[PDB]
Structure 1
Amino acid sequence: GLSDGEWQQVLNVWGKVEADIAGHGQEVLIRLFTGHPETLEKFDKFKHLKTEAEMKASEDLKKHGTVVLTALGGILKKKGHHEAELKPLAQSHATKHKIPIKYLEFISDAIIHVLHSKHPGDFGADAQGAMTKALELFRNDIAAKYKELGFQG
């Protein structure tokens, strides 16, 4: 798990996201979709987005970014004690949305990228380490639920 010090770092970094949840959420999804176009195909509601300009101009993409980061934020503030919050997400993403765990790796990496891109020189090495641990814990606990379900993709 994470130490108390590491959790404090995670939640301090998260304050950056909370100051502009929509902007961070938008950029995370754009980084995901542009880096990994196959991910867009999991979203029937974003398939029409054929250019990054269209992605940037999409109100609905910003809205979904807010939904995604709000859910993740709720999970992070549990400091690992997130079974009730994480179980339903793991199950909707495996059974309804059919999201391979690889894509959760992609979005985790996208969050780290966006934090550096929006806050260059202000996302320190200790902060990256702590946030990375938190995202790995999130992904790993989802992975355990995926295995229960026998879900691969």
Structure 2
Amino acid sequence: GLSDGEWQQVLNVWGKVEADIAGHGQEVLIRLFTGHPETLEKFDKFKHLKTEAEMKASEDLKKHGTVVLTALGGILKKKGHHEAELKPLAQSHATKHKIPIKYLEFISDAIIHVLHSKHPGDFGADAQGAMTKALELFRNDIAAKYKELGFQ
């Protein structure tokens, strides 16, 4: 698990995200779609987005960014007692959306990059560590539900 000190750092970092959840959520998704265009194909609602300019200008992309990060914030604030919040996300991402676990690895890396991009020099070595642990716990707990389903 994460230690208390570690959960505290994660939640301190999450405070930075909450000041602009849509902005953060949009940049996360844009970072994902542009570094991994296969990921765009999982979204019929974003597949028409031919350019980064188009992605940037999509209010519906922002809205979904808000949905994504609100759900993750929910989970993070549970400090690993997150099974009730996590299991249904796991299940819809395997069964409905068909999201391989590697794509969750991609979006985890995108979150780390965006935190550095938006908080250069304000997201220290300790904070990166604690947030990376939190994101690995999230991803590992979803992996566990995927295995149960035999997904991927």
TM-score (norm 1): 0.99
| Correspondences of 1:1-153 after superposition (within 5 Å) | 1-152=1-152
Alignment gaps of 5+ in structure 2: none
Deviations 1:22-44 (A, max 9, x none): 00000000000000000000000
CA RMSD of aligned residues (A): 0.2
Q: Report the secondary structure of 2:113's partner residue.
A: helix
CA drift of 1:121 comes to 0.2
Deviations 1:36-60 (A, max 9, x none): 0000000000000000000000000
Count of residue pairs brought into register by the alignment = 152
Give me the whole-angstrom Cα distance separating, in 1, the residues matched to 2:50 and 2:117: 23
Give me the whole-angstrom Cα distance separating, in 2, the residues matched to 1:54 and 1:77: 33
Give me the whole-angstrom Cα distance separating, in 1, the residues matched to 2:148 and 2:65: 28
CA drift of 1:131 comes to 0.0
Give me the whole-angstrom Cα distance separating, in 2, the residues matched to 1:147 and 1:138: 14
Alignment gaps of 5+ in structure 1: none
Deviations 1:49-108 (A, max 9, x none): 000000000000000000000000000000000000000000000000000000000000
- The ranges of structure 1 where at least 4 consecutive aligned residues each deviate by more than 4 angstroms after the TM superposition are none
CA drift of 1:145 comes to 0.1
CA drift of 1:13 comes to 0.2
Deviations 1:82-139 (A, max 9, x none): 0000000000000000000000000000000000000000000000000000000000
CA drift of 1:151 comes to 0.1
Give me the whole-angstrom Cα distance separating, in 1, the residues matched to 2:83 and 2:6: 20
TM-score (norm 2): 1.00
